[PDB]
Design a protein around this ligand. Structure first.
Ligand SMILES: [C]C1=N[C]=C([C][N+]2=C([C@](=O)([C][C]C([O])=O)S[C][C][N]C(=O)[C][C][N]C(=O)[C]([O])C([C])([C])[C]OP([O])(=O)OP([O])(=O)O[C][C]3O[C](N4[C]=NC5=C([N])N=[C]N=C54)[C]([O])[C]3OP([O])([O])=O)SC([C][C]OP([O])(=O)OP([O])([O])=O)=C2[C])C([N])=N1
Ligand SMILES: CC(C)(COP(=O)(O)OP(=O)(O)OC[C@H]1O[C@@H](n2cnc3c(N)ncnc32)[C@H](O)[C@@H]1OP(=O)(O)O)[C@@H](O)C(=O)NCCC(=O)NCCS
Ligand SMILES: Cc1ncc(C[n+]2csc(CCOP(=O)(O)OP(=O)(O)O)c2C)c(N)n1
Ligand SMILES: O=C(O)CCC(=O)C(=O)O
Ligand code: SF4
Ligand code: SF4
Ligand SMILES: [Mg+2]
Ligand SMILES: [Mg+2]
Lengths: 572, 291, 572, 291
């Protein structure tokens, strides 16, 4: 049985393609449904082809899906761009007649529903309301809750007047009549309204900004870069309310430098950037490792290399996150999967930075940045907050004192009798420069054993599927994880002996836990959106698994059918 | 508001010496600047627990190790950047930045203008020796063209830059210049720089006898020319003319000083207009995400 | 049979310890001997423990040796640092009386020669000439060609004045009488001057500058960093003679930026830096890979992480050299071994950059940087020179045209009918921005297959040792190679079943040749001076060898006895 | 000596348009600057085969794509650095840099002083829209404080910097300012910038109607104030006063122009004094390493 419906709407930006997608999401959310959206803006700021795809279901959603079930074209270019995907069995709504095109030979089996969208908008002497007519048409044909749909438009258009709201509502049911006038033959219906669960809708980047605030953020320093600038916008808006500060530095080096300055002063600090920014922060992240200063860097991964594809999808910064520092300069690297992790794991990042006095890197991606989801409404007391180990005042203070857990207690400025230095030079217990052989071996073992000890406290590598021996094991990271969840729903439903593992702690990696997984797997498939198979590289180097890399690098994420098809070939 | 000034009574310079012995060559002008920092901290009765000395990379940048206070030894050219995060996070501390001429106007020249523009309440002590000391004598943005040095065996193919004119153009609200051989000039100008609320820059000539063969003590002593007291320290145009060295002589004294809002104050106004505080009910922020 | 002599001179920096060592090395070369020096000093200009060790032999040398035969202490700290190595059978010259220390009970059999060095310096009213009285004393005791010694110190100290030179010449013959007047009981004598074979003496960094010049260098941009500043000094001195230019940029980012700018203009360009600089160059090196612009970066590795140990020995930039770029951004990584490689492999770097239009990184280290060696006299025509593939003018030009070898012909500005763009954005054949999926996959395969084809053209991985099956195999890179060479002379002379392999092409790595080696080895030992065992990481990831990491991270290189002792442990 | 000028006869502005259509928003002020770049190339008869246009990252930096010449699209804020390597290697080429205010005085602010100081013979056309355009509306070092933008919803917590004053202090040998709404003013000042042998800086106000809602055409139209013809373009002090905007009005025209050695010339003297040339006997260099 099909419980979800995938609706893709496309057209010229400015005709309300993005807003119409958000309204459908809010309507299904008010009706107690799970929503998973994904949008693309036009490739140029001046205008062009915009695309929004909303997925509503009665059960949990984990990715975008294989392809759309319902497509809605506002003009001819939207049709030609998606013509390859308008396959038999799918519903097709388009702007006809009155539009700027007549559809080609519609393949036999395609449920076509021509709706004069531009005509009814022109008949009302207001082309601005073209997107409202499609909302009424899609609400009728595929059972979108009209009461919640008109409520979302009321909350948005009520502040302009009573005649502004009543006019757009008239365009809605005008398209509702054009729709119900046609013969509904498609088997596609949005699940019926359930009890509205206590949830919220949030985009991934906004979730990172919230996760920082809920995690005790006090200082944020940013420099704009696509697709991570949104995080600074959320933090610049809301963090000043909570007594914190955001500063827009002159570049990424200055931004991460300011983070260390505020972290040495005792404040929880972080920054957000993308690929090119992380590569500029490499030298300062090594300083963070050497001086043992806590700091958080969220890298919303975009396409590379170099300037690359700033707006496309790619998870290719794992080589840089782990080996990006000169000398032996390790980092704590995490990678989120959904909007949920963008809040919890940004909290976890600040905590692990506080707990281990080390640079922490949180890997996101460009899709997850803009994708909006329905997540359980968060409460500030739901999250564990960790703070840096503070000196008890007893004895004589040493900033880099050798302890049993290698974590030297910290002291913010102003603490009496705790004057110390944080330094980038190799040093002794008091922070003084020390070039001796035995001290370098001693301090490397202090800082490495300290950071490696995260494996004894942070465990985020879920396993689902069959419990016994499996024909094929699947290991993936990032937002590809959610794609493999839905792929595992289908593979297990056919009774295949497959299991999956979803690492979210990337470095250091629990080598022993990897071997425990790959021991019960005849073959291991590692799907990731990067050219070199970067996670597969660290699996061959550190564990005993010999994996099978399933690598794509075209600026697009995986779909569940791609994963399912790849597994069945290796089952044999 | 800095809360570190006038908190200790009957203080001597030696109370601000740390357990770390100096590493500089005998005769190096950095000793005078360090001694000028000591006397300045003593005349202000600074509780050094609320004192932050942050440096970049170079012989000059080894100074925080020798001061008994909170301190940081950061990367090359990033001291003023790291210090800005320190000053903003804890506006109560007295923040001082120490570094060389190459550290400041070469790799760090990108962070210089925004420090002074945003008027961060901190002091920048730049030790100008006209050469790269710790890396063994390569010419700097302040080296004279005729000098022959490590990577310039056939002379410098460009002219030096004006550190005072740069900072005046960038908009620093306290600009002064001194010579390391006048340790009471250093101590006074550094003292007024710390009390000033704004970005205070102090350019101090410091000889390097080990590698710099032409910018010697005798040369710096003849190059300087103390500013007359009838000079108006609020006339930006007159200070820029002083910086451009009339008659070839570099000024010493106070060139420019003015009061203007600092970065941490403007950051505070943003929080004040919002009624922001640590105990904000964060659930209001999450409520905006309801469908 | 012992053919070599090791003379170590130590003392407080600023007392002329390094200058005295260079004179001894130059003197042994005039006597037709092979020389291998090694120096260590503190990161501070005028104080700390300074050490110079010169090795003269009648056969080829490959490292510094296990320990000294003759030791000379200028002060008390020099004595205590080497006291454990002043074992019976060694000669001992020290500053007594008048120094700042008195040596403890000198063990029976140690040929002690107390020389009042500091006393005579005060007697001449010039303490700067303190090291010359020790220089004159050492010349007598061990038959150093005294005639050449006064010539080399005159050329170096003539530029200090006329009265400074007359004082240093007075200290030489003052110490000359004190030494031979004493009873010579040591069996250590430098061989009498023979005909000097046709060689030259050169420090490692100076040799890198020469190889670049001989390879056709036209533009050099440098920023000072230890221990890489010397390369800029040699290049600034001599490259202007050959029609080239050197510019000192404002930072390492500007430095590598200028290199690409001059290389896009059509000239062979390169730069030299160290750990912190390479980490700052990470973003621009990615631009070089994406735009397919040739450029060379010589990274003289120092101690890390962060500011680290700027003057010590370490090979810890392998993680940064290969994975230092965001996205999939590979580099061609080489690693030199001796002064010979500092010329030949710097030519190879410029050639491999020109031939494959890719960023090339040549890794050196701090010891080899300052070590001077005797190498055969090079001739400019001895070296193969490769130039970038230039457009023939036929047809319509496309900067990123797809060809059979994936190498698009280049065209310098000014070339008629060849106006084009070099870009960091993902692009098509003509350089225009192209974000399509198929093009990203196509261009990733173009640039990777291009750079990966170096394995089909450049092979530098010598293998020596036993011909059949071996009990233990040794794989190492950098200057550790020469240390393992001397270790292999001792292991093979005793008839042990061991073989060694010396990779000098590090990335991309010839996986097939590595597996061919590891097939004939029961155990494989990978000695490297870095904390994490960085080459061992890339050995486990890309090959089938399961190596044994022998990792030290104390700022000191290996010695042959350390390798030999480690080998015999794994044999049985 | 640049060899790209006056090599082509009877050239029109449209002769330097490339096959790539423009991507800018309708009304964007960068169009005026682009059309001024065309007219300047045409009035000079430039053989664009000896013309190199190097840009960084931003809406402003997409201009080289629309120019028929050799061109480079590098990283954010590094165009002037990359262009320096081009200009030194090939002093015959006409080198031009195009980029925005954020590209130039933010991430690229470290390379700006050394370009003008060393007096590299190239042209810098900075398109000043007072905002970060391509990243969708964050404030810039030239943004006014009262503006509310992407990351500054509660106003700008610092004052803007003066682009003309920075370059005059840095020592640029040709400083001009124009408005994009006067495309023949841009073309003339750009023309003289290219002919000039030295570092020529041209600051041009370019509206961004999509994201900057206060720095509009009407605002820029009133902000300008043309420089009087009796102004002395050799008086640096008078040019700095014009740069400081007397009466609140920004100057347009030529502020400062002077003849001085360029970087490639001083680099050439080093080669000339050594008798250096391509066919030097490299064995002479190797001979110095003989024992
Ligand atoms: C990002 C980045 N970038 C970059 C960089 C880099 N940097 C820096 C650093 O890092 C630092 C760090 C810290 O802080 O630490 S690097 C380091 C460097 N250092 C080094 O190198 C060390 C030095 N030293 C040494 O080496 C030693 O000590 C010695 C000197 C060598 C010793 O000596 P001796 O043993 O004694 O021997 P000799 O050679 O001989 O010497 C002596 C001398 O004298 C003389 N004499 C002797 N004898 C005699 C007789 N008999 N007679 C007569 N005479 C005599 C001889 O001849 C000699 O002489 P001469 O000629 O040689 O002189 S840092 C930097 C920069 C800085 O800058 P600035 O900012 O400006 O600051 P300042 O303050 O410094 O200025 C850099 C760039 C990084 N990091 N990062
Ligand atoms: C890409 C873009 C063209 C999308 O336009 P669109 O599909 O009409 O999307 P929107 O509905 O969000 O924009 C229309 C605005 O008028 C309102 N609008 C939506 N439907 C409307 C209708 N039927 N009638 C009248 N107004 C309507 C929207 O609420 C929105 O205003 P808001 O800022 O209060 O949300 C537009 O966002 C744009 O120009 N962007 C520039 C770059 C960018 O992405 N900016 C956003 C981040 S700063
Ligand atoms: C290293 C790096 N950091 C950040 C970015 C993101 N980025 C792209 S354009 C841009 C700024 C463009 O603004 P501006 O320089 O003023 O030019 P404009 O768009 O106004 O013409 C930024 C910060 C980037 N592309 N690269
Ligand atoms: O599209 C370009 O030219 C680059 C833009 C970019 O890198 C960004 O917005 O981060
Ligand atoms: S090298 Fe120069 S700057 Fe450094 S300590 Fe010695 S004299 Fe001072
Ligand atoms: S975003 Fe602004 S600067 Fe960019 S093209 Fe549009 S109007 Fe011009
Ligand atoms: Mg200096
Ligand atoms: Mg701009």
């Amino acid at each position: 049985e099909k419980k979800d419906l995938i609706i893709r709407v496309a057209g010229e930006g400015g005709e309300g393609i993005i807003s119409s997608g958000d309204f459908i999401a809010a309507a299904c959310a008010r009706a107690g449904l799970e929503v998973y959206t994904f949008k693309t803006f036009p490739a140029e700021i001046k205008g062009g082809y915009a695309m929004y795809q909303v997925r509503a279901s009665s059960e949990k959603l984990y990715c975008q899906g294989d392809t759309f079930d319902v497509f809605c074209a506002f003009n001819g270019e939207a049709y030609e761009q998606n013509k390859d995907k308008i396959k038999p069995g799918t519903a097709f709504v388009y702007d006809y007649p009155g539009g700027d095109f007549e559809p080609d030979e519609i393949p036999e089996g395609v449920f076509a529903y021509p709706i004069p969208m531009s005509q009814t908008a022109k008949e009302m002497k207001s082309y601005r309301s073209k997107n409202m007519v499609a909302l009424g048409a899609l609400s009728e044909l595929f059972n979108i809750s009209e009461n919640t749909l008109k409520e979302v438009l009321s909350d948005k258009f009520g502040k302009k007047g009573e005649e502004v709201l009543a006019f757009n509502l008239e365009a809605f049911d005008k398209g509702k009549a054009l729709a119900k006038a046609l013969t509904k033959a498609d088997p596609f219906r949005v699940a019926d309204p359930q009890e509205p669960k206590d949830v919220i809708i949030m985009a991934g980047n906004d979730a990172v900004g919230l996760g920082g605030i809920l995690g005790g953020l006090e200082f944020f320093s940013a420099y704009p870069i696509t697709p991570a600038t949104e995080v600074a916008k959320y933090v610049a808006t809301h963090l000043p309310k909570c007594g914190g500060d955001l500063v827009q530095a002159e570049d990424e080096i200055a931004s991460i430098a300011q983070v260390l300055g505020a972290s040495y002063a005792g404040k929880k600090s972080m920054t957000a950037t993308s690929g090119p920014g992380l590569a500029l922060m490499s030298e300062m992240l090594g300083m963070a490792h050497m001086s043992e200063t806590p700091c958080l860097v969220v890298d919303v991964q975009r396409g590379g290399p170099s300037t690359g594809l700033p707006t496309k999808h790619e998870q290719s910064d794992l080589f840089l996150a782990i080996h990006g520092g000169h000398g032996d300069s390790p980092r704590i690297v995490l990678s989120v999967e959904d909007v949920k992790d963008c809040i919890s794991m940004t909290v976890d990042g600040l905590n692990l930075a506080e707990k281990y006095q080390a640079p922490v890197i949180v890997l996101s991606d460009g899709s997850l940045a803009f994708s909006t989801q329905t997540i359980p409404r968060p409460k500030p007391e739901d999250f564990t907050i960790i703070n840096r180990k503070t000196w008890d005042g007893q004895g004589t203070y040493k900033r880099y004192e050798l302890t049993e857990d290698n974590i030297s207690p910290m002291a913010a400025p102003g603490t009496p009798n705790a004057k110390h230095i944080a330094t980038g030079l190799e040093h002794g217990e008091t922070g003084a420069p020390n070039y001796s052989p035995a001290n370098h071996e001693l301090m490397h073992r202090k800082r490495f054993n300290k950071q490696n000890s995260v494996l004894d406290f942070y465990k985020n590598m879920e396993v689902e599927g069959v419990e016994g021996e499996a024909d094929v094991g699947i290991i993936t990271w990032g937002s590809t994880i959610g794609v493999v969840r839905e792929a595992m729903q289908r593979l297990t439903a056919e009774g295949l002996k497959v299991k999956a593992m979803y690492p979210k702690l990337l470095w250091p990696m629990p080598v022993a836990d990897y071997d425990a997984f790959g021991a019960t797997c005849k073959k291991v498939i590692v799907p990731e959106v990067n050219f070199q198979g970067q996670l597969s590289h660290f699996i061959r180097a550190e564990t005993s698994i010999k994996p099978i890399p399933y690598t794509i690098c075209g600026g697009l994420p995986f779909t569940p059918e791609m994963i399912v098809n790849r597994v069945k070939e290796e089952i044999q | 508001t800095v809360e570190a000034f006038h908190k200790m009574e009957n203080m001597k310079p030696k109370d601000y010496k740390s357990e770390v012995p100096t590493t500089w060559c005998p005769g190096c002008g950095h000793f005078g600047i360090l001694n000028g920092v000591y006397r300045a901290m003593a005349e202000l009765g600074i509780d050094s627990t609320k004192f932050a000395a942050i440096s970049g990379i170079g012989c000059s940048s080894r100074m925080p190790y020798f001061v008994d206070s909170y301190k940081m030894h950061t990367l090359h050219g990033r001291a003023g950047a790291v210090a800005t995060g320190t000053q903003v996070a804890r506006p109560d501390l007295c923040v001082v930045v120490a570094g060389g001429d190459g550290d400041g106007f070469s790799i760090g020249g990108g962070h210089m203008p925004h420090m002074a523009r945003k008027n961060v309440n901190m002091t920048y002590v730049l030790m100008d020796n006209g050469i790269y000391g710790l890396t063994k004598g390569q010419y700097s943005p302040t080296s004279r063209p005729e000098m022959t040095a490590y990577t310039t065996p056939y002379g410098g193919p460009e002219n030096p830059m004006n550190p005072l004119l740069y900072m005046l153009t960038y908009g620093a609200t306290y600009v002064a210049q001194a010579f390391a051989g006048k340790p009471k000039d250093c101590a006074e100008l550094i003292k007024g720089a710390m009390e000033h609320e704004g970005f205070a820059y102090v350019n101090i000539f410091s000889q390097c006898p080990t590698f710099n063969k032409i910018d010697t003590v005798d040369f710096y002593r003849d190059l300087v020319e103390p500013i007359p007291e009838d000079h108006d320290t609020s006339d930006l145009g007159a200070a820029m003319e002083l910086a451009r060295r009339p008659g070839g002589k570099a000024p010493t004294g106070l060139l420019y000083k003015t009061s203007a809002p600092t970065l941490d104050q403007n950051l505070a106004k943003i929080r004040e207009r919002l009624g922001g505080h640590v105990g904000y009910d964060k659930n209001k922020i999450i409520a905006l995400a309801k469908p």
